[PDB]
């Protein structure tokens, strides 16, 4: 939900006996297929933009700029990880292609299928279709009653 790692603890030991369908957890930070030549930035985090499209947010001028969940004509990148202690968000610029699990809007998530063009809303959630090239590579997976994730490939601007 609001944390990459489960906020509550667990009362059981994992079986660790199977190898299939084990990467669906929300704590799976980063991309699924990553290149060593990827440009990675970091920014101060305003809110929780984890696994969402991020845009630049400024202030009066007394403090440096930061990144907040957003999209549309102001999209700047995609957040793939967050260090909570330092309040830092890892950003992959939109000029660098990305492939990984991203948050999907809980509206018509069943209609999302592989090959469906997607775009970022004002809250940084992927929504079914403008100016950003993103393609879904799988179907929506439910983590919470309001949390759905989809594997997507973002490859620049239209």
């Amino acid at each position: 939900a609001l944390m990459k790692n489960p906020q509550q603890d667990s009362g059981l030991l994992s079986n660790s006996i199977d190898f299939r369908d084990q990467n669906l957890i929300f704590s799976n930070s980063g991309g699924v297929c990553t290149s060593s030549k990827d440009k990675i930035e970091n920014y101060p985090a305003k809110g929780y933009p984890y696994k969402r499209g991020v845009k630049l947010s400024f202030g009066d001028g007394t403090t440096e700029l930061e990144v907040e969940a957003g999209g549309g004509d102001d999209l700047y990148g995609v957040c793939s990880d967050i260090d909570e202690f330092s309040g830092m968000a890892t950003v992959i610029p939109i000029t660098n292609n990305f492939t990984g699990y991203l948050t999907l809007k809980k509206d018509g998530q069943n209609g999302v299928n592989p090959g469906d063009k997607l775009n970022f809303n004002q809250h940084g959630e992927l929504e079914k279709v403008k100016s950003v090239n993103a393609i879904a590579l799988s179907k929506a997976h439910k983590l919470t009653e309001d949390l759905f994730i989809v594997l997507a490939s973002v490859f620049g601007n239209r």
Partner: protein
């Protein structure tokens, strides 16, 4: 077709103009920090070598098929026919190298567009171009396939005419 393409009875006969080969190294100017990805391609539909390709997520794997500029994922720079694997430079990266064209008479500096077959054509065909492609050299024919040196740098803001 293929890239390597055969026993010869005799050997084939300056340093200038020796790069005009179908199986030449695609990148005229390479660079570390260039991202290269691997995908599967259809071994009976279209040969994607030196063509603009698009991602087609199939029911068993994500393939790359020759595609137009409107839905282009990148440029296929090399193919391994033994494993039928295509190597793709994403459109987010710059490219300067030789690509397959269908017009045997293209001059230098002309604006170009990729058609539905992943083939370089003149941008005056009518479809609104969405990618910045420029001809760095005149098209040359290898006897037959037509090749041309092009520079591709990102998408175009507003589609041209």
């Amino acid at each position: 077709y293929s890239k390597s393409m055969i026993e010869n009875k005799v050997f084939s006969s300056c340093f200038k103009s020796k790069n005009e080969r179908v199986d030449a190294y695609s990148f005229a100017c390479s660079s570390y920090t260039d991202k290269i990805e691997e995908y599967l391609y259809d071994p009976a539909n279209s040969f994607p070598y030196k063509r603009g390709v698009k991602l087609v997520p199939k029911e068993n794997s994500i393939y790359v098929e020759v595609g137009a500029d409107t839905d282009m994922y990148g440029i296929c720079v090399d193919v391994c026919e033994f494993s039928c694997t295509a190597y793709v430079l994403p459109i987010t990266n710059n490219f300067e190298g030789y690509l397959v064209t269908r017009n045997p008479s293209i001059k230098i500096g002309e604006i170009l567009d990729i058609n539905n077959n992943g083939v370089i054509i003149k941008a005056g065909g009518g479809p609104p171009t969405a990618i910045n492609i420029y001809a760095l050299s005149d098209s040359f024919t290898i006897n037959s396939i037509n090749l041309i040196k092009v520079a591709i740098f990102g998408n175009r803001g507003l589609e041209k005419t």
